[PDB]
Amino acid sequence: PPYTVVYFPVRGRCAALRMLLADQGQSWKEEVVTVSCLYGQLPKFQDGDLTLYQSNTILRHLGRTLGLYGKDQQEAALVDMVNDGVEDLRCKYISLIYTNYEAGKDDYVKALPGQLKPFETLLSQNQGGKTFIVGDQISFADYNLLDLLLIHEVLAPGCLDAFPLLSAYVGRLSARPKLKAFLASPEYVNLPINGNGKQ
Amino acid sequence: PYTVVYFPVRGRCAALRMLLADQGQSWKEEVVTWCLYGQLPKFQDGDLTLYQSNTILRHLGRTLGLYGKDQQEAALVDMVNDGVEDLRCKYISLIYTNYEAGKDDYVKALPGQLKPFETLLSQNQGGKTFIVGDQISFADYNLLDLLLIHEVLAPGCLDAFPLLSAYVGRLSARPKLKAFLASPEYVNLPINGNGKQ
Numbered sequence: 044p045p046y047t048v049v050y051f052p053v054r055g056r057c058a059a060l061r062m063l064l065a066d067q068g069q070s071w072k073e074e075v076v077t078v079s080c081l082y083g084q085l086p087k088f089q090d091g092d093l094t095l096y097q098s099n100t101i102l103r104h105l106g107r108t109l110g111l112y113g114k115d116q117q118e119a120a121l122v123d124m125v126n127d128g129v130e131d132l133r134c135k136y137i138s139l140i141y142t143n144y145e146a147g148k149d150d151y152v153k154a155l156p157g158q159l160k161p162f163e164t165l166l167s168q169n170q171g172g173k174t175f176i177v178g179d180q181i182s183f184a185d186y187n188l189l190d191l192l193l194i195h196e197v198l199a200p201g202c203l204d205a206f207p208l209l210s211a212y213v214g215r216l217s218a219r220p221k222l223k224a225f226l227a228s229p230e231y232v233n234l235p236i237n238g239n240g241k242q
Numbered sequence: 243p244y245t246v247v248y249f250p251v252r253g254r255c256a257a258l259r260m261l262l263a264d265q266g267q268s269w270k271e272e273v274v275t276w277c278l279y280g281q282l283p284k285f286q287d288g289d290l291t292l293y294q295s296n297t298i299l300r301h302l303g304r305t306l307g308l309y310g311k312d313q314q315e316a317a318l319v320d321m322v323n324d325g326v327e328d329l330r331c332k333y334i335s336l337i338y339t340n341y342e343a344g345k346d347d348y349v350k351a352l353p354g355q356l357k358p359f360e361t362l363l364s365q366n367q368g369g370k371t372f373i374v375g376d377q378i379s380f381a382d383y384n385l386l387d388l389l390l391i392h393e394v395l396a397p398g399c400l401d402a403f404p405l406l407s408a409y410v411g412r413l414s415a416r417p418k419l420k421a422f423l424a425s426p427e428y429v430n431l432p433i434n435g436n437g438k439q
């Protein structure tokens with residue numbers, strides 16, 4: 044395969060790009076790192092002899108090369124705006140999981156709905172929330188947002204009950220045939236979400 | 243035309259301002275004294291309204307041809323910019339949540355955080371051009387800003403890194419950028435909001 048994902052045996056920052064690859068029928072190899080790198084971190088991603096680091100770099104690159112970055116330049120910017128919002132919330136989530144889980148979790152969950160609402164609002168403005176997060180075609184931001192929502196449902200079950208378009212969106216994206224099969228597969232299910240047992 | 247809405251600080255708008263100025267563009271500053279993510283900057287390009295400084299950088303990158311020569315370079319641009327923003331998130335967290343008790347450790351770790359950019363320059367035409375390829379990209383403006391604010395936080399932080407040192411000098415000497423960097427519109431704004439730097 045021309046694609047290789049080098050990462051810890053976790054879903055982590057590779058979950059979204061993996062969903063993307065699975066859903067667009069792409070083949071890739073997984074290289075596992077048990078407990079060199081430009082920024083001293085994984086994921087590392089190979090596409091032929093191109094070596095990328097940074098999960099969002101990988102998403103944008105797949106977004107550009109597989110046509111999942113909007114239909115024009117304005118949509119592409121909106122895709123970025125969504126992904127940057129997803130990543131802002133991910134940065135807080137990761138800090139929680141890895142540096143303040145037991146003490147911060149109740150404060151984090153309190154603030155959660157106000158950090159989710161912006162995505163509900165975006166959906167409500169795009170064809171009634173019935174298609175994708177931007178435009179009428181799936182983008183890399185949809186896979187990343189989907190992941191973010193899936194991992195938050197585990198952290199704070201019901202956190203989407205207050206948000207009907209986000210709820211239906213998750214169920215709708217999750218039932219895409221190729222993606223539904225992947226999320227059910229051992230390759231996905233048998234990895235933990237993070238690398239410290241907390242979720 | 244362009245509108246930038248933001249506080250009277252350099253902050254997250256400094257890079258995209260350097261870009262606009264250096265690319266000979268005109269824009270309106272709407273100074274706020276207090277949205278999609280409850281956050282600024284807000285940016286207007288005609289009917290289009292963007293939030294998030296890196297979204298604004300990528301947009302201008304796309305529309306002005308500052309995003310590499312091809313898809314491979316575009317990915318390397320993103321890689322650099324994402325690395326710049328990882329350190330910027332650290333920097334910001336220091337400034338606002340732990341300046342006086344964190345500063346020592348931050349600066350000790352700083353050479354390790356800068357070296358990857360020296361290394362990238364070293365692997366690209368001997369560090370004599372830009373951070374990726376042969377043309378300036380939105381990532382150059384962002385990295386330049388990171389480097390300027392870090393020279394204020396920890397003067398001499400670049401002495402150990404000749405390619406990055408020459409790079410700041412070269413880019414800073416570009417005519418329109420040089421004029422903008424010397425201007426009161428830049429000089430007379432604080433870097434951050436809480437008066438720490």
Ligand SMILES: [Pt+2]
Pocket residue numbers: 134135331332
């Ligand atoms: Pt962060």
Ligand SMILES: [Pt+2]
Pocket residue numbers: 133134135137
């Ligand atoms: Pt982070």
Ligand SMILES: [Pt+2]
Pocket residue numbers: 134330331332334
């Ligand atoms: Pt941050």
